[PDB]
Amino acid sequence: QGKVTFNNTVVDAPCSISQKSADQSIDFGQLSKSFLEAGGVSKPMDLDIELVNCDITAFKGGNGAKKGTVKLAFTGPIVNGHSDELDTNGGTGTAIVVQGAGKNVVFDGSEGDANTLKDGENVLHYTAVVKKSSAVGAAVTEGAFSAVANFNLTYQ
Amino acid sequence: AVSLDRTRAVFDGSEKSMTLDISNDNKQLPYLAQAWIENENQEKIITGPVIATPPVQRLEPGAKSMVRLSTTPDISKLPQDRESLFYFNLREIPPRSEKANVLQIALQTKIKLFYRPAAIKTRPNEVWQDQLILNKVSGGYRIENPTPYYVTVIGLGGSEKQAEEGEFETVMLSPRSEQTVKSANYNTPYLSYINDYGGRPVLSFICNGSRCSVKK
């Protein structure tokens, strides 16, 4: 059945993602509390997601494709009242914002933009930055932080 | 890192269970894989009638593994003359990062799981979608699905090429149901759907009046 069954009929597969790093992470490096505390935003880190095993002619399509057979969407703990701010661990007071095709990514499940596919390749290009959380009394404190976002692909 | 083997799953009701192959495409680190079922409204279902086992498992680098899909006795309550809709979920849990200030991405794959009762068991390359009917309506078409299965329509156009590459909002018709779509009048309609294998065939219609059916 499907993968244990064998014959001429090709069965297309869902995508498998991977990044430059083995743990599927992006390192922001040490950040200045003072800078963040003053409204500063870290230098944008590239968040590239490689799509393998699947026909990319569905993510903004490869060489075209206007239809949408796969829905893309990010999910993660948000900042109270700000669905576009991925909350963080460690209590540092920081938050994370990811930008797609010029527009911010929302982490409440709403359909994302399956239009970030780098024309010509099989990579979704996003950018991420760290900033003082936009929550009342945030206060950027020092220390290490981390966050996990769910990249959801739903197939029709 | 974790991935599934198909974009949709058909559960043959004449059987008590089936397996889905999963894989850790990462060659450096282990990843956890969670699997679970959702009902037709995408609500998590824990006690049946369809169960995914194991709910969570560890996959060493490059490891291949499987998730079993099985049913409880109550699966018999579902209608036996039409498909029922479920969703299969596969979410990975990446290992904790070695680095300090970091953001990790975790993939989650969600596909359709069709419960196909024994009474409507299908042949290896049987085609029922050619049973679809098109009804001209003001501003478009009413797509009729008189079959006992779920049909996913991904294209409607005046030519085979347009059905395949033309802008179209994918719509899935439940068994014995219909849906209206905005569209231009085509004297020769072509429709494209997704079959059990993830293939995307194209049907050619011949209209007579405001009714259109696939040509023999």
Numbering used by the authors:
A (entry chain B): 8 to 163
B (entry chain A): 1 to 216
Quoted passage from the original study:
The P pilus, produced in uropathogenic Escherichia coli, displays the adhesin PapG responsible for targeting the bacterium to the kidney epithelium. The PapA rod is formed by more than 1,000 PapA molecules assembled in a right-handed helical manner, with 3.3 molecules per turn. In a process called donor–strand complementation (DSC), the G1 β-strand of PapD inserts a conserved motif of three alternating hydrophobic residues (called the P1 to P3 residues) plus N101 (P4 residue) into four binding pockets in the hydrophobic groove of the pilus subunits (P1 to P4 binding pockets).
In order to investigate the PapD/PapA and PapA/PapA interactions within the P pilus rod, the first structure which we solved was that of PapD/PapA, where two mutations were introduced in the papA gene. This was necessary because PapA in purified wild-type PapD/PapA complexes tends to spontaneously polymerize, and self-polymerization of PapA has prevented structural studies. Thus, in addition to the G15N mutation, a mutant where residues 2 to 8 were deleted was next constructed. The deleted region is just N-terminal to the DSE region of the Nte of PapA. This mutant (PapANtd1_G15N) did not undergo spontaneous polymerization, and formed a stable complex with PapD. Crystals of PapD/PapANtd1_G15N diffracted to a resolution of 2.6 Å, and the structure was solved by molecular replacement using the PapD/PapK structure as a search model. This structure is very similar to the already known PapD/PapK, PapD/PapENtd, or PapD/PapHNtd1 structures. Like PapK, PapE, or PapH, PapA lacks strand G of its Ig-fold; PapD complements this by donating its G1 strand.
